[PDB]
Structure 1
Amino acid sequence: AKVHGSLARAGKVKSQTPKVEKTEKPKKPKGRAYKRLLYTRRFVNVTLVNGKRRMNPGPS
Protein backbone atom coordinates (compact mmCIF):
# COMPACT_ATOMS: atom_id res chain seq x y z
CA ALA A 1 0.00 0.00 0.00
CA LYS A 2 1.31 3.45 0.89
CA VAL A 3 5.13 3.78 0.76
CA HIS A 4 6.13 7.45 1.12
CA GLY A 5 4.89 8.03 4.68
CA SER A 6 6.56 10.65 6.90
CA LEU A 7 10.13 10.20 8.06
CA ALA A 8 10.30 13.16 10.48
CA ARG A 9 9.88 11.05 13.58
CA ALA A 10 12.61 8.48 12.99
CA GLY A 11 14.46 8.06 16.31
CA LYS A 12 11.72 9.78 18.26
CA VAL A 13 11.31 7.95 21.51
CA LYS A 14 14.96 7.06 22.07
CA SER A 15 15.93 10.71 21.71
CA GLN A 16 13.30 11.85 24.22
CA THR A 17 13.65 9.27 26.97
CA PRO A 18 15.52 11.16 29.74
CA LYS A 19 18.99 9.78 30.33
CA VAL A 20 19.81 8.20 33.62
CA GLU A 21 23.44 7.14 33.94
CA LYS A 22 24.18 3.62 35.17
CA THR A 23 24.82 3.20 38.89
CA GLU A 24 28.21 2.08 40.19
CA LYS A 25 27.89 -1.29 41.90
CA PRO A 26 30.04 -4.12 43.32
CA LYS A 27 31.95 -6.05 40.65
CA LYS A 28 30.66 -9.63 40.20
CA PRO A 29 33.13 -12.54 40.30
CA LYS A 30 33.71 -14.14 36.90
CA GLY A 31 33.90 -17.87 36.13
CA ARG A 32 33.67 -20.59 38.83
CA ALA A 33 33.10 -18.12 41.69
CA TYR A 34 29.94 -17.00 39.88
CA LYS A 35 28.65 -20.51 39.40
CA ARG A 36 29.60 -20.77 43.06
CA LEU A 37 27.69 -17.68 44.11
CA LEU A 38 24.65 -19.01 42.25
CA TYR A 39 24.78 -22.41 43.96
CA THR A 40 24.74 -20.92 47.43
CA ARG A 41 22.06 -18.42 46.34
CA ARG A 42 19.96 -20.98 44.50
CA PHE A 43 20.27 -23.94 46.86
CA VAL A 44 22.50 -23.81 49.96
CA ASN A 45 21.09 -21.11 52.23
CA VAL A 46 17.85 -20.72 50.22
CA THR A 47 15.80 -17.51 50.51
CA LEU A 48 11.97 -17.71 50.58
CA VAL A 49 9.26 -20.31 49.96
CA ASN A 50 6.12 -18.15 49.56
CA GLY A 51 3.79 -20.67 47.97
CA LYS A 52 6.73 -22.13 46.02
CA ARG A 53 9.86 -20.05 45.11
CA ARG A 54 10.69 -16.88 43.13
CA MET A 55 13.89 -15.64 41.45
CA ASN A 56 13.45 -11.93 40.66
CA PRO A 57 10.63 -10.59 42.85
CA GLY A 58 10.41 -6.94 43.90
CA PRO A 59 7.59 -5.86 46.23
CA SER A 60 5.85 -9.06 47.50
Structure 2
Amino acid sequence: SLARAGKVKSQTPKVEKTEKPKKPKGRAYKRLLYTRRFVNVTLVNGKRRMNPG
Protein backbone atom coordinates (compact mmCIF):
# COMPACT_ATOMS: atom_id res chain seq x y z
CA SER A 1 0.00 0.00 0.00
CA LEU A 2 0.90 3.69 -0.25
CA ALA A 3 1.69 6.17 2.55
CA ARG A 4 4.88 4.19 3.15
CA ALA A 5 7.07 5.75 0.44
CA GLY A 6 10.38 6.97 1.80
CA LYS A 7 10.09 5.09 5.10
CA VAL A 8 13.78 4.16 5.45
CA LYS A 9 15.16 7.40 4.00
CA SER A 10 12.94 9.31 6.43
CA GLN A 11 14.02 7.22 9.43
CA THR A 12 17.69 7.23 8.41
CA PRO A 13 19.87 9.20 10.88
CA LYS A 14 21.27 12.38 9.34
CA VAL A 15 24.98 11.79 9.81
CA GLU A 16 26.61 14.97 8.55
CA LYS A 17 29.63 14.98 6.27
CA THR A 18 33.15 15.07 7.70
CA GLU A 19 35.39 17.88 6.46
CA LYS A 20 38.61 16.60 4.90
CA PRO A 21 41.34 18.36 2.93
CA LYS A 22 40.57 18.48 -0.77
CA LYS A 23 42.11 15.98 -3.15
CA PRO A 24 44.46 17.32 -5.85
CA LYS A 25 42.49 17.17 -9.09
CA GLY A 26 43.82 16.10 -12.47
CA ARG A 27 47.41 15.15 -13.22
CA ALA A 28 48.13 15.53 -9.51
CA TYR A 29 45.42 12.96 -8.77
CA LYS A 30 46.93 10.61 -11.34
CA ARG A 31 50.30 11.13 -9.62
CA LEU A 32 48.75 10.41 -6.21
CA LEU A 33 47.18 7.19 -7.50
CA TYR A 34 50.43 6.15 -9.19
CA THR A 35 52.38 6.60 -5.95
CA ARG A 36 49.67 4.88 -3.91
CA ARG A 37 49.67 1.87 -6.25
CA PHE A 38 53.17 1.46 -7.72
CA VAL A 39 55.69 2.45 -5.03
CA ASN A 40 54.76 -0.70 -3.06
CA VAL A 41 52.93 0.91 -0.16
CA THR A 42 51.66 -1.45 2.54
CA LEU A 43 48.50 -2.54 0.75
CA VAL A 44 49.54 -5.98 -0.51
CA ASN A 45 48.00 -8.56 1.85
CA GLY A 46 49.60 -11.39 -0.09
CA LYS A 47 49.07 -10.24 -3.69
CA ARG A 48 47.21 -6.88 -3.77
CA ARG A 49 44.42 -5.06 -1.96
CA MET A 50 42.68 -1.71 -2.30
CA ASN A 51 40.55 -1.33 0.86
CA PRO A 52 41.22 -1.98 4.56
CA GLY A 53 39.16 -4.03 6.99
Common fold, TM-score beyond 0.5? yes
Q: What is the number of residues matched between the two proteins?
A: 53
Alignment partner for residue 11 of structure 1, among 6, 10, 34? Answer: 6
The range that moved more, 46-55 or 21-30, is: 46-55
Higher relative contact order structure (alpha carbons within 8 Å, sequence separation ≥ 6): 2
Deviates more, 1:37-46 or 1:14-23: 37-46
Structure of larger gyration radius = 1
Once superposed, what is the RMSD of the aligned Cα atoms? 1.2
The answer to whether the 8 Å contact 2:43/2:50 transfers is no
Q: 2:26 aligns with which of 24, 31, 50?
A: 31
TM-score between both structures, scaled by the size of structure 2: 0.87
Gap runs ≥5 in structure 2:
none
Q: Distance in 2 between matches of 1:11 and 1:50?
A: 41
**Percent identity of paired positions between Structure 1 and Structure 2:** 100
The TM-score, its normalising length taken from structure 1, stands at 0.78
Give, in angstroms, the shift of residue 46 of structure 1. 2.3
Q: Counterpart of 2:47 in 1: which secondary structure?
A: coil
Q: Is 2:23–2:29's contact at 8 Å kept on the other side of the alignment?
A: yes
Shift, 1:45, TM fit: 4.2
Runs of 4+ residues over 6 Å off in structure 1: none
